[PDB]
Write a protein that binds this ligand. Structure first.
Ligand code: MG
Length: 155
RNA sequence: AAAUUGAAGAGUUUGAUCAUGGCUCAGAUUGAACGCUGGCGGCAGGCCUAACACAUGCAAGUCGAACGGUAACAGGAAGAA
């Protein structure tokens, strides 16, 4: 019922006394389509084995995101080691406007309308981390209402 | 009542990685030029260079209801016609 898709696959190497030892890495994102999204990173000698490992890694380490209506509550800015991510909620019907890694993360999470831009490095492993960081730190008016002790007359 | 409801990335330094950093590409546009090809119509546009030199024709005339006047055409009439 939940959706899963593969971000990128990369071949890595570890040289030994005999020579190189080739390996394959898989970055995947798993989301239920509501705002519960996670990512998994796995390593294996074979591409099917590597992608499978990332699949179970993503089912654990799931997070929850509070969405308004298929979109973000407010503009959000997610920063990881070398990647800067700016996402802001857009109007209905505008669709998803984001880079490769961010679009997959966003679409499996369940955000249909969003304007998202990536600054800094565009390494898939780090932009996915930055995107997850933004969806965390974004908040909901009811949790803010309890946070400030001011009820929900703000909106 | 309606009057911007708007932001995408990729390749390349390494045995492999992250970062930094340049180079390149995917878009739109043009008073365009060239190559290959070419049926029609509508609208628009068309010396960006030598403010270089110019044959030829035209591009500022009009008024007789300002004036003298009759070169020219037509009308009008004295008269050997
Ligand atoms: Mg000129």
């Amino acid at each position: 019922e939940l959706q899963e898709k593969l971000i990128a696959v990369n071949r890595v190497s570890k040289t030994v006394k005999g020579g190189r030892i080739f390996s394959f890495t898989a970055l995947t994102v798993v989301g239920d389509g509501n705002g519960r999204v996670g990512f998994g990173y796995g390593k294996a000698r074979e591409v099917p084995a590597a992608i499978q490992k990332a699949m179970e890694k993503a089912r654990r380490n799931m997070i929850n995101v509070a969405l308004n209506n298929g979109t973000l509550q407010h503009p959000v800015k997610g920063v990881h080691t070398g990647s800067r991510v700016f996402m802001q909620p857009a109007s209905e019907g505008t669709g998803i406007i984001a880079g490769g890694a961010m679009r997959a993360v966003l679409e499996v999470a369940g955000v249909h309308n969003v304007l998202a831009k990536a600054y800094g490095s565009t390494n898939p492993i780090n932009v996915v981390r930055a995107t997850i960081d933004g969806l965390e730190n974004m908040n909901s008016p009811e949790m803010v209402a309890a946070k400030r002790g001011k009820s929900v007359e703000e909106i």
